[PDB]
Amino acid sequence: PPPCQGPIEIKETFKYINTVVSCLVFVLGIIGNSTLLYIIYKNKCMRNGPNILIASLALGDLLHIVIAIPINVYKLLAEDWPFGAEMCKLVPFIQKASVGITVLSLCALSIDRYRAVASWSRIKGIGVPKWTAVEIVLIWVVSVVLAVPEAIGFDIITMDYKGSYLRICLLHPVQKTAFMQFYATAKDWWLFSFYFCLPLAITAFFYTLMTCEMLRKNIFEMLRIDEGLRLKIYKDTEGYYTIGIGHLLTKSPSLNAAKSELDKAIGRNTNGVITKDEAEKLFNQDVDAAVRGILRNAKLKPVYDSLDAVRRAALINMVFQMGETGVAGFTNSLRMLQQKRWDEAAVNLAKSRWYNQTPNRAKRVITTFRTGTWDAYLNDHLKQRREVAKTVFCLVLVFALCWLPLHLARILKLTLYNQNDPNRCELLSFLLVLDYIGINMASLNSCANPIALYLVSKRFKNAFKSALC
């Protein structure tokens, strides 16, 4: 009710700069999303489950960029709504529909890639799964159903603002039904909770579970290269029957007794021969047993707790080769690892009999300590898992950054606007420029998805060059 020291306005200087920016986002978004959908359709090596979910993300962005920028550019320059009450209900409906398509396709992509880690065939993304089709139709149907309240609640207001005639397309303050009257109150929170907080929380959860399983496969490949994988029963250096990656079966001289120990451990009648997946499951149990002993060891626990995941694997590698006691004897090098003194620890470890007796394995483990990367064990499967993890990480990072300003501009309008203040009117003039910048940013997601795929996927980088040649 109290008056204000100025009229809510935007500088014409701003209107001309932002419009130029909005023109670039629109042209690059249409080209990037169309070519992205083109290379996924043309190339047959890219016609798989994960890319189909990317195409659903690309269409939702291509749909959003079409109904968001061209109408908010006009709303900026012309400052009026001349499209009738049908477009006033249709435009925000298609908008919230397209946005819901992208956040659910993102969520489905993170879930799909997490389930694919367990199988080498799935993480390569070969073929189209069965329920891929029915999942997309559910994503699009649920997206438009949740966008329905946006359609019915919008209408054209005709009011008098200081003697000026205004056609205002907006969400009507008073609604007939009681549910819709409630939707108009907390709509900005529903947009903030469901179209930003929930997809970021869901993707971050399944991405974390994915890389945790990727970590277990890195260690298995590390120990297979260093120690060796034996899929048939063999005798170790002491004559004891062993299988897999150094897994002792029994100290009995009876091969037949050792075979029954194997059958108990695998849950299968193996006749002395196991599969790689069974050796891996057996190895993952040996790691968990090894970690439990490390955490119960007073000399290895502080070092292990302070190390990152890659370097913890290098320490587990040493325990597999020498045992807890033999590793705890490296009292000085372990101290340097806990103080994060890599290069010094790398130099010190190279003086050991361990380095002198098995130099190839020792060099790899020391490099892992020095660098903290898997560069010493880079192999075919690690690269595939590395490319997958990069793909979904950038797509969710592009999403969170592009939709943060628009979502930020709406959540500070809810908590800082107080209609009783005399000077509150001109902070909306600052929210006016934020809400229009947030429209260019959210539309940049349509353009930044192809750029992200070009940089992290070698196949997308080559397919993009092919389409623009």
Binding site: N72, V91, P92, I168, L170, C425, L428
Partner: peptide, 14 residues
């Protein structure tokens, strides 16, 4: 809240 409906007149559609 008439300064608010004028805000929605200048604001984007979201």
């Amino acid at each position: 809240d008439e300064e608010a409906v004028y805000f929605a007149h200048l604001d984007i559609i979201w």
